[PDB]
Amino acid sequence: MNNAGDKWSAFLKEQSTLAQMYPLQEIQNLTVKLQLQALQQNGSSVLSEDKSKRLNTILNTMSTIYSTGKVCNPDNPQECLLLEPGLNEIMANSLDYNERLWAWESWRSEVGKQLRPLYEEYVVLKNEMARANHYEDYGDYWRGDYEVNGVDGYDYSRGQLIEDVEHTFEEIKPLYEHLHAYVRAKLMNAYPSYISPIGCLPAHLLGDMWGRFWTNLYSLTVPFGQKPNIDVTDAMVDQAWDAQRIFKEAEKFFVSVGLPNMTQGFWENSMLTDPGNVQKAVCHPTAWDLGKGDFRILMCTKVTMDDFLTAHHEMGHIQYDMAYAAQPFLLRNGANEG
Amino acid sequence: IPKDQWMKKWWEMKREIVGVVEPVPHDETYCDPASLFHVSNDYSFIRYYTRTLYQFQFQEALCQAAKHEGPLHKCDISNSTEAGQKLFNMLRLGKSEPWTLALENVVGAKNMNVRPLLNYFEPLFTWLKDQNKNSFVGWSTDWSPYADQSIKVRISLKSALGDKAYEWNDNEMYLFRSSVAYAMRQYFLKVKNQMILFGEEDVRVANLKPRISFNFFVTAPKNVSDIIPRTEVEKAIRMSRSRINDAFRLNDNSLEFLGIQPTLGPPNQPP
Amino acid sequence: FVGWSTDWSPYADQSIKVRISLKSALGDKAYEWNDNEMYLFRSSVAYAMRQYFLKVKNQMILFGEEDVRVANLKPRISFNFFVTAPKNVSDIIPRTEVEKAIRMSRSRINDAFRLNDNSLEFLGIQPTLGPPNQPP
Ligand SMILES: *[C@@H]1O[C@H](CO)[C@@H](O[C@@H]2O[C@H](CO)[C@@H](O[C@@H]3O[C@H](CO[C@H]4O[C@H](CO[C@H]5O[C@H](CO)[C@@H](O)[C@H](O)[C@@H]5O)[C@@H](O)[C@H](O[C@H]5O[C@H](CO)[C@@H](O)[C@H](O)[C@@H]5O)[C@@H]4O)[C@@H](O)[C@H](O[C@H]4O[C@H](CO)[C@@H](O)[C@H](O)[C@@H]4O)[C@@H]3O)[C@H](O)[C@H]2NC(C)=O)[C@H](O)[C@H]1NC(C)=O
Ligand SMILES: *[C@@H]1O[C@H](CO)[C@@H](O[C@@H]2O[C@H](CO)[C@@H](O[C@@H]3O[C@H](CO[C@H]4O[C@H](CO[C@H]5O[C@H](CO)[C@@H](O)[C@H](O)[C@@H]5O)[C@@H](O)[C@H](O[C@H]5O[C@H](CO)[C@@H](O)[C@H](O)[C@@H]5O)[C@@H]4O)[C@@H](O)[C@H](O[C@H]4O[C@H](CO)[C@@H](O)[C@H](O)[C@@H]4O)[C@@H]3O)[C@H](O)[C@H]2NC(C)=O)[C@H](O)[C@H]1NC(C)=O
Ligand SMILES: *[C@@H]1O[C@H](CO)[C@@H](O[C@@H]2O[C@H](CO)[C@@H](O)[C@H](O)[C@H]2NC(C)=O)[C@H](O)[C@H]1NC(C)=O
Ligand SMILES: *[C@@H]1O[C@H](CO)[C@@H](O)[C@H](O)[C@H]1NC(C)=O
Ligand SMILES: *[C@@H]1O[C@H](CO)[C@@H](O)[C@H](O)[C@H]1NC(C)=O
Ligand SMILES: *[C@H]1O[C@H](CO)[C@@H](O)[C@H](O)[C@H]1NC(C)=O
Ligand SMILES: *[C@H]1O[C@H](CO)[C@@H](O)[C@H](O)[C@H]1NC(C)=O
């Protein structure tokens, strides 16, 4: 896989240099101009060899530091807790203020401090790379994925994204304020004398390590706990729902709205069931568009309602990938990243 | 944002946008946002914002072709071929056309709109508004869990000195922080028999006002996450308040610590 | 002269000597000159340097307690201090500017230790008593 990826990357890089022979100042075909834009972006090839290798080194170092980050007891350095196992459980299940504060502070002091000097250089290197490609800043290069030009009414500038996001967020704020107030009121009864009724929420009491999701706080903020949630996990077991028929149900749901059927080779090449311990495979549900009408799904599907919803989600990606199969390879992607 | 003002800005944005306050103070040596996976691995994060809107813009659109009558959260687009065709008209498009044109083929609009999300969550929004009649909605950017350990100082230069009074610039603040650090050192040396190397960077000051009234708290020498409890700070200030008063030519009334009240002294009596 | 002395240095011409007599100005109730008093004195000197560089040269220089280097501490409380660059120790502020800074803010330094111009001698900075104003 590394050899194949390196060959593909080398081919893409050498074709990027060849694409420079056709400037955008003379291209008049819309799809041709867009493909030229897609293949013309230098990316990290515009920096010097030393700067490029330093950027790759710091990126790899940051990734490794995040991956290997462990919180350890000074008394016994041998025993440590990793991020995914244990620490997430501590942040999502514990009802002790001191324990959650310790987990949050230890994670943000053991990984953040080691990442600050690297991130300082990463910012400068990314800014230099962006400026070498006629961009004001690297964030502008990020926002460039929504850039639309030369359509006479559909045009979208990179600086328009900031103002649009700012305008849209002010219309969510009225709902977010009430949701935050309710969450604070409900947490007042779980962590007394720590949640002020007049102030904000402490960062370590949001059910997750970073507060990106408040899902784990549901148990502490359920509106009516006496009424059970809609669960159909046991019903599927009673009807003996294996991980072969739920995909059929999802396919029927898709075809009910007019979307096409599944490919003949999709079911044969798929891995809708875990291969057990004999074969080592990944379990993150992913959709794969290999090409030449080859669409596949990787998923260690269990018997769960969440598995059913995830199967629907992955079939959505599969259908989207199948929809634009006739488009040129450079245009075989969504309208934007979202 | 200057390189030496990242965290102070970051926790200034969380306090007024997300409404989340850090439990313990963080200096510039921390990189809290880098603790997130998507920040330390160079992934654009705005994608997760727009995707949150688009789906609802899609869903609210697809329930119009499906002819949904009830609330949006009860809508089902199944068994509706028109909605499927409307979605497929954009799905087959791919990147060949601008994303605005793709949106106009489903939602009929060229720019992203947030109204579908509010329409989806309206049944919850009404209940939440009805559930917060007595509680206080919103948050304040001035409270923090460590604000209970802060000591407020109020200084009146032109009342104790009248004329010939110096101006309270940054140098006077440095001198005041050094005096506080010296007082902490004296308290920890003469009482607890612990040699702690405090400095002018370990007396953190906020909320400076033209009245010369701020809030300072003393942290650990190089462990900013650790804050000295307020009782020990008050004892240290009481122990060496005369030196602090002498350093600024104030006398116990133009330098008020708002919680440390001085003692005048017993009026000794004849037999 | 054969031999050498371990007390001379090319930068010793920029040093300012401070002599302090606690038990003469205060008699009793006099504090002891431990390391905390030295930290306070270095902070006062750094503050004086900041004030001089802000009110005269219009240059914002961030001095600290580590930029006032002190040597030759003795039980008399008589040492030699010199003020260096904020983070460029190889650079030493010339003695004339240090003396001007001390003259500018000597009252604050005296007040910080409850000394008055005679128990805090800078050995090179002599104070001025003040003109005896006369009737017509
Ligand atoms: C800079 O300063 C910061 C502080 O600002 C400092 O960080 C602290 O470091 C200490 C030392 O590591 C941390 O204390 C550790 O906590 C570990 C987590 O497990 C405990 O977490 C809670 C701690 O509460 C303690 O105190 C309360 C009140 O006195 C007491 O009730 C607790 O029992 C505990 O002693 C605690 O709530 C939690 O409770 C468990 O049990 C209850 C049931 O009772 C359950 O309901 C909970 O869900 C939870 O399971 C639990 O007890 C802990 O593992 C650790 O103990 C090990 O290490 C020490 C040595 O470190 C050994 O002596 C010990 O035998 C164990 O092997 C220790 O107690 C503290 O949490 C940090 N605080 C913060 C804010 O970070 C930094 O270290 C400083 N850095 C520098 C460089 O100076
Ligand atoms: C921390 O502080 C330290 C200081 O403590 C500081 O280090 C100093 O940095 C400066 C700037 O780089 C250095 O000055 C450089 O000197 C280079 C060496 O060549 C010269 O060296 C002697 C310098 O004397 C200067 O001043 C005298 C008196 O004013 C004057 O007469 C000289 O002409 C000169 O200006 C000098 O003796 C020497 O003389 C040559 O010529 C005579 C004949 O006249 C001959 O007999 C000698 O043999 C010799 O050949 C020579 O002139 C010099 O190259 C350099 O000049 C270049 O750089 C500057 C910019 O830096 C350009 O403006 C200039 O046009 C040249 O391109 C500059 O003059 C100084 O020596 C350092 N001192 C010490 C002690 O290190 C650190 O930088 C500080 N660090 C931080 C982070 O703040
Ligand atoms: C831009 O170029 C494309 C590619 O040539 C044109 O799309 C068609 O592509 C097929 C397959 O390559 C060709 O056989 C056709 O001749 C192309 N043209 C048509 C009209 O089908 C596309 O039309 C071009 N755009 C413009 C505006 O000319
Ligand atoms: C990419 O880099 C080349 C030189 O390496 C430069 O000529 C070109 O303008 C850059 N940009 C594009 C889009 O090719
Ligand atoms: C899809 O294929 C299955 C068998 O693979 C078939 O039973 C079903 O009828 C097909 N869908 C439609 C709409 O015909
Ligand atoms: C005031 O009283 C307190 C204790 O009651 C004492 O420590 C302090 O020195 C007194 N201050 C005077 C007498 O000036
Ligand atoms: C002493 O005289 C000098 C100048 O001669 C002056 O700056 C200083 O303020 C005087 N000190 C007094 C009058 O106390």
Q: Are A147 and B70 in contact (CB under 8 A)?
A: no
Task: Tell whether A222 is within 8 A of chain B (Cβ).
Answer: no
- Per-residue buried b or exposed e for A48-69, using 16+ beta carbons within 10 Å of the residue's own CB: eeebeeebeebbeebeebbeeb
The amino acid sitting at C123 is: L
Identify which of A312, A318, A98, A92 has the alpha carbon closest to the alpha carbon of residue A220: A92
Q: If you take atom 26 of ligand 3, which residue's CA is the nearest one?
A: A29
User: How was this one solved?
Assistant: cryo-EM
Cα–Cα distances (Å) from A232 to A222, A239, A254, A314, B199, in that order, read: 19, 11, 21, 20, 62
Is C39 in contact with B247 (Cβ distance < 8 A)?
no
Which class for C75: exposed (0-12), middle (13-18), buried (19 or more C-beta within 10 A)? exposed
What is chain B's length? 271
Task: Tell whether B3 is within 8 A of chain A (Cβ).
Answer: yes
**Among A163, A170, A314, A337, the one annotated catalytic:** A314
Residue B151: strand pairing partners: B216
- Taking the C-alpha atoms of residue A183 and residue A177, their distance in angstroms, rounded to an integer, is 10
- Taking the C-alpha atoms of residue B227 and residue B216, their distance in angstroms, rounded to an integer, is 11
* Residue B20 parent element (H or E): strand B20-21
Scanning the structure block, which residue is given the tokens 């603790």?
Answer: B35
Identify which of A291, A285, A287 has the alpha carbon closest to the alpha carbon of residue A318: A287
- Taking the C-alpha atoms of residue C73 and residue C34, their distance in angstroms, rounded to an integer, is 11
Sequence-distant contacts of A182-186: CB under 8 A, at least 24 apart? A182/A221, A182/B128, A182/B131, A182/B132, A182/B135, A183/A214, A183/A217, A183/A221, A184/B135, A185/B132, A185/B135, A186/A220, A186/A221
Identify which of B247, B249, B259, B253 has the alpha carbon closest to the alpha carbon of residue B181: B247
Residue B153: strand pairing partners: B214
- Taking the C-alpha atoms of residue B228 and residue B241, their distance in angstroms, rounded to an integer, is 18
The structure tokens listed for A74 are 């000074």
Q: Are A311 and A247 in contact (CB under 8 A)?
A: yes
Please, which residues have CB within 8 angstroms of residue B208's CB and are 6 or more apart in sequence?
Answer: B173, B214
Residue B171 has its nearest CB partner, among C36, C50, C64, at C50
Q: Are A261 and A247 in contact (CB under 8 A)?
A: no
- Taking the C-alpha atoms of residue B46 and residue B37, their distance in angstroms, rounded to an integer, is 14
Please, which residues have CB within 8 angstroms of residue B136's CB and are 6 or more apart in sequence?
Answer: A181, A197, A198
Q: Is A38 in the pocket of ligand 4 (CB under 6 A)?
A: no
Query: How far, in whole angstroms, is CA A131 from its chain's centroid?
Result: 27
Count CA atoms closer than 13 A to C118's CA, side-chain side.
5
- Judged by DSSP in three states, B213 sits in strand
**HEC string for C33-74:** CCHHHHHHHHHHHHHHHHHHHHHCCCCCCCCCCCCEEEECCC
**HEC string for B95-110:** CCCCHHHHHHCCCCCC
Which class for B196: exposed (0-12), middle (13-18), buried (19 or more C-beta within 10 A)? middle
* Residue A264 parent element (H or E): helix A264-269
- Taking the C-alpha atoms of residue A142 and residue A154, their distance in angstroms, rounded to an integer, is 20
Cα–Cα distances (Å) from A334 to A109, A271, B101, in that order, read: 39, 25, 13
Identify which of A338, A83, A79, A73 has the alpha carbon closest to the alpha carbon of residue A210: A83
- Taking the C-alpha atoms of residue A23 and residue A124, their distance in angstroms, rounded to an integer, is 29
The structure tokens listed for C6 are 């371990």
- Per-residue buried b or exposed e for C116-134, using 16+ beta carbons within 10 Å of the residue's own CB: eeebbbbeeeeeeeeeeee
Q: Are A269 and A295 in contact (CB under 8 A)?
A: no
Task: Tell whether B146 is within 8 A of chain A (Cβ).
Answer: no
Task: Tell whether C44 is within 8 A of chain B (Cβ).
Answer: yes
Identify which of B117, B118, B145, B124 has the alpha carbon closest to the alpha carbon of residue B20: B145
Please say if A79 is a catalytic residue: no
The structure tokens listed for A92 are 């999502």
The percent helix, strand, coil of chain A (3-state, each to 5) is 55, 5, 40
Residue C36 has its nearest CB partner, among B186, B246, B247, at B186
Q: How many CB pairs under 8 A join B and C?
A: 49
DSSP per-residue codes, A146-174? G-B-SSSSS-B-HHHHHHHHHHHHHHHHH
DSSP per-residue codes, A284-336? S-EEEE-SSS-EEEE----SSHHHHHHHHHHHHHHHHHHHTTTS-GGG-S-SS
Which strands make up the sheet holding C16-20, listed edge to edge? C68-71, C78-83, C16-20, C120-121
Please, which residues have CB within 8 angstroms of residue B259's CB and are 6 or more apart in sequence?
Answer: B151, B152, B234
Please, which residues have CB within 8 angstroms of residue B206's CB and are 6 or more apart in sequence?
Answer: B150, B214, B215, B216
- Taking the C-alpha atoms of residue A181 and residue B250, their distance in angstroms, rounded to an integer, is 45
What is the separation, in whole angstroms, between the first and last Cα of chain A?
28
| DSSP letter, residue B18 | I
Is C54 in contact with B169 (Cβ distance < 8 A)?
yes
Q: Is A17 in the pocket of ligand 4 (CB under 6 A)?
A: no
The structure tokens listed for B63 are 């329930």
